[PDB]
Design a binder for this molecule. Sequence first.
Ligand SMILES: *CC(=O)N1CCN(S(=O)(=O)c2ccc(OC)cc2)[C@@H](C(=O)NCc2ccc(OC)cc2)C1
Ligand SMILES: *CC(=O)N1CCN(S(=O)(=O)c2ccc(OC)cc2)[C@@H](C(=O)NCc2ccc(OC)cc2)C1
Lengths: 244, 246
Amino acid sequence: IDLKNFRKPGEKTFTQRSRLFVGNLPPDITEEEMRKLFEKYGKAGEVFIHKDKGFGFIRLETRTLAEIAKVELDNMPLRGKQLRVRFACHSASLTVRNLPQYVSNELLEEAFSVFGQVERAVVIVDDRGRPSGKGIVEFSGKPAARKALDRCSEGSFLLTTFPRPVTVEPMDQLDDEEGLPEKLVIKNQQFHKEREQPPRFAQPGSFEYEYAMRWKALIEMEKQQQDQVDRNIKEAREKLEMEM
Amino acid sequence: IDLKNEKTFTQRSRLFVGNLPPDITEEEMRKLFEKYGKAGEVFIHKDKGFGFIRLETRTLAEIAKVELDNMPLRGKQLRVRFACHSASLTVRNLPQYVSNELLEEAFSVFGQVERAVVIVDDRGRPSGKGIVEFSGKPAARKALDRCSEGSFLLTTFPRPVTVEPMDQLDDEEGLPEKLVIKNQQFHKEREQPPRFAQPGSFEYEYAMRWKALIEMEKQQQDQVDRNIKEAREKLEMEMEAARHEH
Ligand SMILES: *CC(=O)N1CCN(S(=O)(=O)c2ccc(OC)cc2)[C@@H](C(=O)NCc2ccc(OC)cc2)C1
Ligand SMILES: *CC(=O)N1CCN(S(=O)(=O)c2ccc(OC)cc2)[C@@H](C(=O)NCc2ccc(OC)cc2)C1
């Protein structure tokens, strides 16, 4: 299995999306040895090593090059330690909501580029191709993300002729890939209290069944409350959009 | 640049190969993807110009996507993308002390499960939501029906989990400028560039009415969220209070 032109010329290189966290490093890990571990992926960008704690950061060229380095070097033995290679979180990512119509990735990137250099901008799209009203804007550095978050909350940032300001907020970063493995679970007393009963269906008649059926009725109660608010919001937004 | 190296041939490694030439054959598909090892199912809509091919691992599909995307093939440029999962489920109201292995073990009673993830926040805590990926639609259908009829309990705490179809959202491709239809309403909306509403204009007054309405939506949502959390507390305290049954 060989490759070479592992690049997409349209998008930038050495962004935060290609920065890898490397844990469980040997005590005397050097910056040159760290680069030599990743030298097969071409030249690396920013490399930091905290030699005491045994962790480090390395910035590869492209995102797909880092995904190859992750699955190849994760859990790899190196002088008595199993290396932990994960993708670092993005330090300057923003969530954009209330997007108007006819907004693309390029327009979203062009719009927020006035606050600083932008690495990536996405208009989140459903399974059928239409936008969901939400988007992602990733800046190269924290100051550009701080400026975009402050100005868009104070003033009204308009992307199109439609004078509805977009809402900017920090990206709620959720890990739906690594999750919570069994070895990372806290094995305490409340652990074994819940783990006493295996996964099962509640037997009709027991205390579990009656208590769970009240939860199902309560969850259905929550759905009726939320869906009532959703219809109230739509009628309120159609009221403002009606007047001129 | 040499590579060497878990469940194999899951839906996570199925690639959509679109914009195919008319005379595309099945052995030609396995010829382009032959450097990535032996492949699984190779479907070809031999009249619509698209198809699917499943590779061994997710990594072998990640590498194959960037190499064979926009590759010339008899006058046409290929469009290689990851196919969507046809049997993914969202599990909400997860109890505490639930791991990825426990979630996979639990829902395996409905059929073959490929992957199960307990969604975790940025601080290492479970968000209460989870993902369950079955190998096929029938297994996901049984999990959805059974968990809505009866109460499926994963731990000792008698709170049933909620199983709903996965709402698949694309935050990688997004919406490029090419896909936007260049109609008259498009140009009408693009007359004004991205800008801040300057005070005094008509768009500034109308925009302030929107920020006021958005704030009212924030208070309405937070009022419901407090009414839901406290109502759940009115039920969680009745656990051991009513456990004195017999
Ligand atoms: C989602 C998030 O914000 N996180 C989780 C991931 N990490 S980490 O990969 O650096 C990490 C920390 C500790 C650890 O031992 C238990 C294992 C992994 C954090 C993160 O990625 N922050 C982003 C960031 C910002 C600036 C810099 O400067 C180079 C690097 C990374 C917190
Ligand atoms: C998220 C989603 O549901 N999608 C987006 C991805 N595609 S596709 O790129 O494969 C595609 C198919 C047909 C088409 O019209 C010519 C254009 C694009 C879809 C998808 O992958 N669905 C999942 C799926 C289910 C079953 C099978 O084979 C049995 C393949 C794929 C829709």
